[PDB]
Design an enzyme around this catalytic site. Structure first.
Site, short mmCIF file in Angstrom:
data_model
loop_
_atom_site.label_atom_id
_atom_site.label_comp_id
_atom_site.label_asym_id
_atom_site.label_seq_id
_atom_site.Cartn_x
_atom_site.Cartn_y
_atom_site.Cartn_z
CG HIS A 21 -0.40 0.24 2.47
ND1 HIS A 21 -0.50 -0.68 3.50
CD2 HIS A 21 0.24 1.34 2.95
CE1 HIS A 21 0.01 -0.16 4.57
NE2 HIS A 21 0.47 1.11 4.26
CG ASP A 49 -0.47 -3.90 2.77
OD1 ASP A 49 0.20 -3.46 1.81
OD2 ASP A 49 -0.84 -3.23 3.72
CB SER A 96 1.89 1.34 6.92
OG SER A 96 2.12 2.41 6.06
N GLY A 97 4.43 -0.45 6.67
CA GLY A 97 5.56 -0.95 5.88
C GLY A 97 6.66 -1.47 6.79
N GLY A 113 2.02 6.52 9.34
CA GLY A 113 3.46 6.68 9.04
C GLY A 113 4.30 5.49 9.48
#
Ligand SMILES: CC[C@@H](C(=O)Nc1ccc(C(N)=O)c(F)c1)n1cc(OC)c(-c2cc(Cl)ccc2-n2cc(C(F)(F)F)nn2)cc1=O
Length: 236
Positions: free
Chosen positions: A44, A93, A188-189, A186
């Protein structure tokens, strides 16, 4: 990260900050070094990213304020998004960034191991979420990498909290019953990192939640062990 504390230099050396440079340079997402030329992050993160050319990967960063016009960064050769990915809240994801060159590993930039062949039934009890995300709903990207310890919750319990979403075996949830600690905007990932027999494993990728650190609303993470065959396929 909500309810977290400042990290120190060297504490999370697999953590990266992925920046966009368009239309201005800013932190987009976290990610994890899993190999000399490989970052694992959330698919995403690339929503409205026109190409890999505008990406920069910064490793060995504690404070976003270290990044100046002379700070070295890795160019991204390729973004590899899972071919079943549609949106974070429906799963798959996961993405790899192939770097333009190999990271020389140092105290400040190290790989994290994937979940190990043979540990699919390990109960991880020491899991940490890290990132420069908001520390509450209405906030800003933080200067200093934050950390928070968070318990894993059963898929069965997670699905009960999100009956409008498909909580699958390819997802893992983490949260306190009464909230107060969680990923937020902020983060995410970036990694959900679990230490087992003093070895860190990349168990989760920060993907989504409804709200940040609400009661009975666990964060949702991509369940990395369910994508080891995909990762190895793409990286080998
Ligand atoms: C691109 C989506 C991304 C995001 O918002 N990124 C982002 C980056 C930079 C800026 C900026 N100001 O520069 C920005 F404003 C937003 N995202 C979405 C999430 O979920 C959508 C989560 C999440 C993950 C867990 Cl495991 C648990 C709860 C959350 N969560 C839920 C919310 C919500 F509901 F308030 F929107 N925010 N974070 C984390 C997360 O990073």
């Amino acid at each position: 990260i909500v309810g977290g504390t400042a990290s120190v230099r060297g504490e999370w050396p697999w953590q990266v900050t992925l920046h966009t440079t368009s239309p201005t340079q800013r932190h987009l997402c976290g990610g994890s070094i899993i190999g000399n030329q490989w970052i694992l992050t959330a698919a995403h993160c690339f929503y409205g990213v026109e190409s890999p050319k505008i990406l920069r990967v910064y490793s060995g960063i504690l404070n976003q304020s270290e990044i100046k016009e002379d700070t070295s960064f890795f160019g991204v050769q390729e973004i590899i998004i899972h071919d079943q990915y549609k949106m974070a809240e429906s799963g798959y994801d996961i993405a790899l960034l192939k770097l333009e060159t190999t990271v020389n590993y140092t105290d400040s930039q190290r790989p994290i191991s994937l979940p190990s062949k043979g540990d699919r039934n390990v109960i991880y009890t020491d899991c940490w979420v890290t990132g420069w995300g908001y520390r509450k709903l209405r906030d800003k990207i933080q200067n200093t990498l934050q950390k928070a310890k968070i318990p894993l919750v059963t898929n069965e319990e997670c699905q009960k909290r999100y009956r409008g979403h498909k909580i699958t075996h390819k997802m893992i949830c983490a949260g306190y019953r009464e909230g107060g600690k969680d990923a937020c905007k902020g983060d995410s990932g970036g990694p959900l990192s679990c230490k087992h027999n003093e070895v860190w494993h990349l168990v989760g990728i920060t993907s989504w939640g409804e709200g940040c650190a609400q009661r009975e609303r666990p964060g949702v993470y991509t369940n990395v062990v369910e994508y080891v065959d995909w990762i190895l396929e793409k990286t080998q």
